[PDB]
């Protein structure tokens, strides 16, 4: 087979090189959840991002549905960006 050395900057590496944005250290999923005695990592299992859905009062249509729609919109935007980068 030919060499798999395909290259593409995805439009992000170009900006990261233009700016002084160093790559994130990529520490881990764990993040401290204040007001509680548990870590509940940012993502991976029982993520804190899902906390807003399981909590009891959402002061200020159900706002939980709005948050879920926002999550779906962000995921679809990421997928669209991936498709755009694949087009190149």
């Amino acid at each position: 087979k030919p060499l798999p050395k395909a290259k593409a900057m995805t439009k992000w590496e170009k900006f990261a090189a233009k700016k002084g944005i160093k790559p994130k250290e990529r520490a881990g999923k764990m993040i401290y959840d204040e007001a509680s005695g548990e870590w509940v990592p940012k993502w991976g299992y029982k993520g804190a991002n899902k906390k807003l859905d399981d909590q009891w009062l959402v002061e200020v249509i159900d706002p939980r549905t709005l948050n879920r729609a926002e999550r779906k919109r962000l995921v679809k935007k990421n997928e669209k960006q991936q498709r755009r980068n694949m087009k190149n």
Partner: protein, 113 residues
Amino acid sequence: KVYKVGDIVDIKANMPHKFYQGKTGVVYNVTKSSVGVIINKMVRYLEKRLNLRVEHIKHSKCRQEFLERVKANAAKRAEAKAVQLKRQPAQPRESRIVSTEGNVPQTLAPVPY
């Protein structure tokens, strides 16, 4: 239970994410996922548009006493028409004699043993 707009419910919780337990409000909106309750709060009094799931909400019996008293007063007036319906605070107890024949006063001796 089928909650309806305008009903009075008590915000009872089953970690916190807030401290509103024990407060009562009136339902202003209802949906499948949650029930909307409005709670008044002082700055003049402001208002908060709370939204809570049915799991942490229950009906309030605050107005049960009012309706029961109204019905009892109406019935009493109807019966007496054939009135002093006003509620009265607990009046001071009157004098009463106590007999020690069946119970000798015992010096409890707070030692006690």
